[PDB]
């Protein structure tokens, strides 16, 4: 039997909002340690990895390992029925074919219970060796979102260049070209850039704009890059875990 009670339900609402636009279905691997979710989008251009530790929940119970196949589009729609101040509980039986979501309003006079069917999903393995990157940039999450949004008005792809001094994001299109340069500042609104060697990569803005849907989950975002390797964009979910996105570069 599975029981996960999250007092700050808005966290789950934000997670689904950050997932649904990128992937429509995924397997939520549940265990005594928490919730793990990993899935590539249909085009295999990006991969999302979610971690929600048991310690982050008010109450957490998962007698046995479970792999629940879930329609994220449907789950997000149901989470729309939860207030931002609702306590949210996810509940499932041992051999669950359904997932129950319970929302407790802050007024204590209203309690909602939603049940959605689970689905069989061919959860695919995806060996990704955690390594070190040539360049790691940490910046305000809102700042990164605004950069991706702005350049999207200019082009469909962004060239990210790293070197001594800062990081530059460049795009070009029919209306002209633009470059946004970020230089290290002197935790939330600061910019830190650790460079091992200059790196230049091109990425599709369409996917980056999907990643920034996770902005409300954290005040900061960290970008990790290395030549000819997937970009990694990470958002820490305050004392819960994190949401990591991987994106294959162009070429």
């Amino acid at each position: 039997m599975f029981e996960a009670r999250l007092v700050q339900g808005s966290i789950l609402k934000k997670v689904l909002e950050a997932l649904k636009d990128l992937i429509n279905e995924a397997c939520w691997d549940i265990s005594s340690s928490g919730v793990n979710l990993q899935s590539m989008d249909s085009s295999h251009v990006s991969l999302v990895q979610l971690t929600l530790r048991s310690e982050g929940f008010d109450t957490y119970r998962c007698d046995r390992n479970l792999a629940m196949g879930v329609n994220l589009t449907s789950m997000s729609k149901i989470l729309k029925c939860a207030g931002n101040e609702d306590i949210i509980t996810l509940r499932a039986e041992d051999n669950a074919d359904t997932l129950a979501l319970v929302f407790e309003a802050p007024n204590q006079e209203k309690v909602s219970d939603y049940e959605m069917k689970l689905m069989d999903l061919d959860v695919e393995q995806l060996g990704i060796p955690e390594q070190e990157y040539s360049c790691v940039v940490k910046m305000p999450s809102g700042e990164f979102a605004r950069i991706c949004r702005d350049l999207s008005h200019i082009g469909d792809a962004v060239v990210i260049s790293c070197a001594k001094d800062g990081v530059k994001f460049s795009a070009s299109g029919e209306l002209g070209n633009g470059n946004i340069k970020l230089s290290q500042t002197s935790e939330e609104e600061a910019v830190t850039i650790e460079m091992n060697e200059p790196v230049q990569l091109t990425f599709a803005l369409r996917y980056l704009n999907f990643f920034t849907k996770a902005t409300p989950l954290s005040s900061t975002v960290t970008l990790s890059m290395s030549a000819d390797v997937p970009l990694v964009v990470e958002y820490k979910i305050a004392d819960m875990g994190h949401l990591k996105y991987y994106l294959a570069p162009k070429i």
Binding site: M40, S43, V45, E124, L126, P230, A248
Partner: peptide
């Protein structure tokens, strides 16, 4: 051209 993560990672899922 846009690459896919399969060209960078081993899957077999």
């Amino acid at each position: 051209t846009q690459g896919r993560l399969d060209d960078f990672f081993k899957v077999t899922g």
